[PDB]
Amino acid sequence: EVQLVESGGGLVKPGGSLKLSCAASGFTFSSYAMSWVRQSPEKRLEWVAEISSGGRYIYYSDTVTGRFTISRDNARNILHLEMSSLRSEDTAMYYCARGEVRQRGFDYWGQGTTLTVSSAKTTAPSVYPLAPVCTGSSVTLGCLVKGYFPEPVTLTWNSGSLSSGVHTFPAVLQSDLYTLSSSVTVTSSTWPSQSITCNVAHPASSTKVDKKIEPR
Amino acid sequence: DERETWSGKVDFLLSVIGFAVDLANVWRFPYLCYKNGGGAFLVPYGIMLAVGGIPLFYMELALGQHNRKGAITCWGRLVPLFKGIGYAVVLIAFYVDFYYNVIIAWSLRFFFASFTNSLPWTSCNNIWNTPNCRPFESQGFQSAASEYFNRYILELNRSEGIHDLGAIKWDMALCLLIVYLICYFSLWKGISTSGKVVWFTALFPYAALLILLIRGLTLPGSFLGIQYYLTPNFSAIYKAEVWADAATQVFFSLGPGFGVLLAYASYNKYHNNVYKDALLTSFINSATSFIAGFVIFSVLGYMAHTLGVRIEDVATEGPGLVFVVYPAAIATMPASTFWALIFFMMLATLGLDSSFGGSEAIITALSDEFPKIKRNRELFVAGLFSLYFVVGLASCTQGGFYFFHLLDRYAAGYSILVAVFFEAIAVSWIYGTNRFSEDIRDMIGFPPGRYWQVCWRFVAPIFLLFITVYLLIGYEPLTYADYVYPSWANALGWCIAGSSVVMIPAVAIFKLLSTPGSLRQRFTILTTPWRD
Amino acid sequence: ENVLTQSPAIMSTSPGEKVTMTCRASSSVGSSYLHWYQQKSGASPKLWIYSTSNLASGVPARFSGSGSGTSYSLTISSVEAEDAATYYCQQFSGYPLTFGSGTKLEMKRADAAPTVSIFPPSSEQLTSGGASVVCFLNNFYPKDINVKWKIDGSERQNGVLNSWTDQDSKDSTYSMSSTLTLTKDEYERHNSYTCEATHKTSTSPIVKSFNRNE
Ligand SMILES: CC(C)CCC[C@@H](C)[C@H]1CC[C@H]2[C@@H]3CC=C4C[C@@H](O)CC[C@]4(C)[C@H]3CC[C@]12C
Ligand SMILES: CNCC[C@H](Oc1ccccc1OC)c1ccccc1
Ligand SMILES: [Cl-]
Ligand code: NA
Ligand code: NA
Question: Could you say which of A44, A111, A167 has the minimum Cβ distance to residue C44?
Fold first, then answer.
């Protein structure tokens, strides 16, 4: 019944300004105090701001105060968080969270929304197909997704038909660019008798690449 | 704007406890139980306590701690339109100090008169006695303790009415002076000292109640009085008069919306758990009354059993109970002088810390509105208590009781009921429960349940109206025994009672005709709270 | 601010084991103001234990908390596999509200040696003027592992991007990819390319290599 959905978020240059929102449903929204809690890249939780049930009581964290502003719409049941003078430390998954009662904490959390603050340039990934070193009972193939920004990227193997034996490795930032890899493992009979294709999708650059692995 | 605060949590609690419990617990609560079906009366009393008194009690305490200002300022900041509530409340507390403190004066007078091997109100062969005097209460007769309190202590017989106050009892004027000297040197430095005086004035009654409970129960016939006290008669619950007595008792014995809990709580820390304070103090007040009932009626049964007096003649209320009936029993039991001195010192401390609260409600509400007297506290309250004393001499005259009785039935009885009525309407409908529940949440961490909100919004106004209507129905031109007050005395009484309520529209009409814009654009400015 | 420190950061636990993670505050916290949250991977945190004693609804009885002042703890009587998550303590005593550094629950399993694959730069990257030699190390345990790149028997230790995966849901193993990145010129001036993985499951490093002539 209770549902919280965050909207807004995305890529923003330092000093930039964006307004996050949270649509609440399933409860008397005007009867509860909402909070914004953000998560680090590092998966650490940090409280941002609290707004009372009538908006007459506001609290900000020391990092956030003076720059962010938490708002309320009890008519349309919407929680807001306007951000300005954005820094690269504000990059986080921002959570819509509600606790009326200090004694009970935050009993409901939204799905969150990702805000990225970077001066790094949006580039497209170079997708490199991988065939292994010119046989065992099983064969292991790979796919290198190199030099892109920002997150995320969507990698699947053969239209996402096979999900067994695949390990996609989380992206790592080096010199303001992300590199990501993935491996798939199939029976040595299956390849190259059949086709194994790498499906890489980078929405920020509108990039859709399908590379398939050639034995040679 | 960050003011002083309590030099200890207990100082505040004992201040509220001290104010909340007084002679009414002793001299009204047990009589009601007796009159309205004994233990069965605890049901309408308890329900009216749960849905009427305690919500209003909790409300004012929260309002005090949150807005952190006195009555006048707090209500002005709450609702600019209904700021006159603050004034209506303050001058009520002002009116009561004129007559209430003489009860404490009477206490000390008996306290001094108890320094004897033989208590003077025992016999009927004294200079102040009449052929109608009998050793104890009797229908068609007067008792030795009644004639002592009337023909000697009060010299009330020498007065033909309120027009004839007669000479001044200087032994009584002295006692009233001593009362204010104590009140002065407890409130002149504020809560830093007042929060310490209440350690005696609010705890001694429990010391006295305990050993008066033991002495009361050890007496022969004590269990008989407990029967008269609490023998259930649930037929009373079906009676509307019983509920009205319950509702009225609960209200006046807790004193919510009187500007004193407001003032006392205004010195609390902002994030103090005032909800726990409301429940704790409310209970202690009613529990004290329950205990005091056993203390009183254990002695009342002892009289009906071993003194051969009717229960109808001794089970009484008000000053007749502790200045006449109870001391009469004391003078018959061994170590009479000990129990006399302690009883009378109990009733004195029982009123003192209440008189502190009443006065402090004024001084605090004025210091927050007028910096001129906040800087000069001692000078102001010296002029205040001097004003109290000067006119208080009228209560020390031979017809002093007639003066006391007039104010008692007019000064605060009706005024505060419709004052607190407008308070409940202001916070639950004008200021809204929404904003008030929000205020409380920010303080103590959580909002009030739906229970308190419903009570503040629907039950409390009906509760207050159920009492105001009831006191109006049972109205009767002011009389005392055979004596009937003149018409002008009754008219003056309504003026005193009216001079308070009239402050509600007077400032409403005033601040309305002080506002830029339109009529719809007056209410919004005068409806919008201070927090903006 | 009142900074909350949680220990351990990472906790290895087999199901059935009793565990206790602690939350330590820099300043005193009211017992009714400290709470606990559980966060599964790829999900939003859930209120787990409020006021350090009271389990939120849905929370199994196996969970409990205790503590006062500046020392609190979350205790599980008997860990289940579905408890693999990160646990955060939070104080709502004073502003600003602070969370704990967090405690991550990871499952144990029998030590697994990594199945290892080496891959030469694609012809496609070679055209671009770059060359990335990629080494895969899959389904091993425990998480920590150490690769080393060799070019013609000589160790090379730069231009490397290592990436671990989080613990797999069912087998409970890990995976790590190493990516040696050279230029076009650097790659062709040599021939033999080697990556070895030293892991506790063997004290001889498994070795995968190739040469530019087959
Ligand atoms: C007369 C007999 C039967 C009952 C005596 C009641 C006494 C023991 C009770 C009634 C009111 C109580 C006090 C009222 C509340 C407080 C504040 C608290 O922070 C400390 C204890 C203290 C100060 C209580 C001490 C015990 C107390 C004095
Ligand atoms: C809760 N306790 C009862 C005493 C209650 O408070 C006062 C006590 C002394 C001076 C002023 C008071 O009121 C502001 C009261 C109320 C009405 C009439 C008399 C007495
Ligand atoms: Cl009472
Ligand atoms: Na009382
Ligand atoms: Na009192």
Answer: A111
